[model samples]
Target: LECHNQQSSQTPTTKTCSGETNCYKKWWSDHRGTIIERGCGCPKVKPGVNLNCCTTDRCNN
Candidate 1:
């Protein structure tokens, strides 16, 4: 198995359609691997922005 977009950092297990995906499945008869997966990641903010957080912030999320 292979990811549709090699440029994307998202993994097979966590990847979402997002209503705008070009993802697909590809198979090679001579492939030597099994159980490949993909997934998506959360958005990250840059140092240029400053966000506020409550004092009760938790790491359990």
Candidate 2:
């Protein structure tokens, strides 16, 4: 899959992953603004934040 990848420190981009890999997007409110992150995998379960993981090319976008 070619999942969209982005973060606070890196340029917005796309990443090709294994066929079975999942795409993910996470966001949370902060003092500056809402911070969103996208990648090929999900992070550890947490609270006070939004997270989504799906299976599809560019799903995280």
Candidate 3:
């Protein structure tokens, strides 16, 4: 499966989800607006953040 790789505050990139779960995350911010974070192989569920999971190809996007 494929996923978007993003960390902290920057742009996103596409990569492979080896063993971890593919996730699509978004955050509501007053300054940055709606932050979209999509990636594969997340260690665990993030607290106080909006995150969703997917299993299909390119599902996170």
Candidate 4:
């Protein structure tokens, strides 16, 4: 599978999934104003944060 991997502190990047990924994720938080992160990985839900997980190629975009 393929994905869009990006972070708020750097340029967006693309990635090719390798192993053990059930979903792609787009996560953010207000804990430090704002944090944007996207990538192909399993769910990583956390408290008080904005997060989305999907089971499709490049869904994080």
Candidate 5:
């Protein structure tokens, strides 16, 4: 699978994923404000988090 690796505030880019992976997106709060990360992996589901797990291409977009 392919995953977009970059700041949510930067240009788009992608990388390859290994074994049993899903396209995922993660968002958290910080100094830069509402930082986001998209990559190839499973969802780290938990409380107080903004994230997603997907199997489709560019689903994080």
Candidate 6:
């Protein structure tokens, strides 16, 4: 599984994905040396013009 390290002070945040046209295949990597916002990747979405989080487990959400 995809995983990463974390620090003592970490907070979750919503992230935005790129190539919204195919957000399902597009993803964003968080910064290093910081636990806050770590593993905060944008939800994958179906291929289309709009960029929204997929509801199915096979996708996002």
* C-alpha local distance difference test of each model: 0.27, 0.81, 0.62, 0.68, 0.78, 0.31
lDDT of 5 by residue, 1-61 (tens): 7777776878998887777468888888878689888888877666888888888667775
Regions more than 4 Å wrong, model 5 = none
| Residue 34, candidate 5: C-alpha displacement in angstroms | 1.2
In the predicted model 2, the residue pairs found to clash are none
Please give, for residues 11-50, the per-residue lDDT of candidate 6 as tens digits.
3223343333221223323465322212223454445433
Q: Show model 6 residue runs off by greater than 4 Å.
A: 1-9, 20-61
Per-prediction TM-score, please?
Answer: 0.21, 0.78, 0.56, 0.64, 0.77, 0.19
Of candidates 5 and 4, the better by lDDT: 5
Model 5: colliding residue pairs: none
RMSD of 1: 16.6
Ten-residue segment with the worst summed lDDT in candidate 3? 21-30
Give the number of the best model, judged by lDDT. 2
Residue range 23-60, candidate 4, lDDT tens digits: 45545656686677777676666675677766677777
Better candidate number, 2 or 5, judged by TM-score: 2
* Residue 34 alpha-carbon offset, candidate 6, angstroms: 12
Weakest ten-residue segment in model 6 by summed lDDT:
19-28
Order the candidates by lDDT, highest first: 2, 5, 4, 3, 6, 1
Candidate 1 wrong stretches, greater than 4 Å = 1-12, 17-19, 31-61
| Per-candidate total of colliding backbone pairs | 10, 0, 0, 0, 0, 0
| Alpha-carbon deviation at 55 in model 1, angstroms | 42
On a 0 to 100 scale, what is the lDDT of residue 38 in model 2? 86
lDDT (10s digit) by residue, model 1, range 1-61: 1113232233323233454323332222225532222222222334533222211212101
The candidate maximizing TM-score is 2
lDDT of 3: 0.62
Over 4 Å off in model 2, which ranges?
8-12
